DNA sequence: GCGATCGC
DNA sequence: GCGATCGC
DNA sequence: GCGATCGC
DNA sequence: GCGATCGC
DNA sequence: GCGATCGC
DNA sequence: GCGATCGC
């Protein structure tokens, strides 16, 4: 299921990530969708591990890691939550689309993709 | 120059390169010719070097050199050859094209390329 | 069964 | 890409 | 991620 | 040569 | 300069 | 894929 990405993203502040417990988590920052704009993936994953390394590559972001965080998004892997909002083992930051795909929701449509924590996104499976 | 390449190729015995030392050395293999027929090249440069590389892929040739040229066919670098027969920096195996570009030679055409040394390519560009 | 990350 | 894991 | 394999 | 992509 | 290979 | 070198 290869295809390319689009979306114009939003604007984040110093605590991006700060939010994404709460309803649909965080977005897709603005300087990060465009270097992602245009581009063409394999799979998810393959998006994942790219925004991620992105993050990892942007100034201003990986100011709001701690460095063994930054590590892993330099390799793809996502950044770990804190304590309060893990679930089990389930430990890293998730991405989450608005709309499933059964729905024809974009993919790699970056507009809508947000970044979760496992806590938050078991609830928004579950409804609440 | 780019181009496509092409030709039969003739059957070589265990000792390819035995006499890439005279007249106009070792022929195309057919296996070679095989493997590389009608391919998009391009430069004859381009050629020499997936040239090479096919010739450590293929089993039977590659058992005829020691590692240390494995490990130069391998990135497309021919094999050097035994001392006596360098010249100067040159020091491994030359492909020698029987007739120019001009004479309608051809210049992808694996029956008019063969394998000579450095100290064999000089005596052919002199007079036999 | 299902979304979602991990590690080669 | 593939095989495996995790919580529901 | 690590070994192939582009691309200049 | 060797950093940067592909293809598992 | 010519026919080739080297060195990124 | 480009310059740069090689020996004559």
Not at 76 to 84: E, L
Not at 95 to 124: A, C, F
């Amino acid at each position: 299921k290869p295809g390319k990405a689009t979306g114009k993203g939003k604007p984040v502040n110093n605590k991006w990530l700060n939010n994404a417990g709460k309803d649909l988590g965080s977005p897709v920052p603005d300087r990060i969708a465009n270097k992602l704009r245009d581009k063409e993936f394999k799979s998810f994953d393959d998006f994942r591990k790219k925004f991620w390394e992105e993050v990892s590559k942007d100034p201003e972001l990986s100011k709001q890691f701690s460095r063994n965080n930054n590590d892993r998004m330099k390799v793809g892997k996502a950044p770990k939550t804190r304590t309060q909002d893990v679930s089990g083992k389930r430990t890293s930051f998730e991405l989450h689309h608005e709309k499933p795909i059964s729905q024809n929701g974009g993919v790699y449509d970056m507009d809508n993709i947000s970044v979760v924590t496992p806590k938050r996104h078991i609830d928004i499976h579950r409804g609440k």
